[PDB]
Structure 1
Amino acid sequence: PSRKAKVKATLGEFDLRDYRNVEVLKRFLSETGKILPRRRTGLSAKEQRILAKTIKRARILGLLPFTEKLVRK
């Protein structure tokens, strides 16, 4: 499960610490606004730990969703 393809593998060279950048960070969330696990994000321990902080920041700023409605169930 969660094996489909590698969120990190397809993406450019980006700053993991940038909360203002949205369009890149969007790819680290599921259909719901939940933060994808390492299985998906493909990141490393430190990378993931930083991503979490960043995403949460952008959430508070209102640039990223806390929660999203699941469609076609």
Structure 2
Amino acid sequence: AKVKATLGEFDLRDYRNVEVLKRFLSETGKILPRRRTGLSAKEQRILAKTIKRARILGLLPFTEKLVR
């Protein structure tokens, strides 16, 4: 169940697409590995770099409390 599948085409730089971006974060708000997003090395860098700006603008969390 890879993340890039459950998503048609999307911009890997649109730091304001909270809806798409938020899926690339684990239930603890962390940036998911490549093994879990399916982005190649080249595209995985641009995802992370835009998650980090989205966090700075406030649209994305830096960490989430783990619930059970």
Q: Please report the TM-score for the alignment, with normalisation by the length of structure 2.
A: 0.97
Q: Mind listing any 5+ residue stretches in structure 2 that lack a counterpart?
A: none
Cα shift readout 1:5-58 (whole Å, capped 9, x = no counterpart):
111111011000010110000110000110000000110111100001000000
Percent same amino acid among aligned pairs?
Answer: 100
Structure of larger gyration radius: 1
Number of residue-to-residue matches in the alignment: 68
CA distance in 2, matches of 1:24, 1:12: 10
Name the Cα RMSD after superposition.
0.5
Q: Please report the TM-score for the alignment, with normalisation by the length of structure 1.
A: 0.90
CA distance in 1, matches of 2:17, 2:6: 17
Q: Mind listing any 5+ residue stretches in structure 1 that lack a counterpart?
A: none
> Secondary structure of the equivalent of 1:14?
coil
Q: Once superposed, which parts of structure 1, at least 4 consecutive aligned residues long, lie more than 3 Å away? A: none
CA distance in 1, matches of 2:9, 2:33: 20
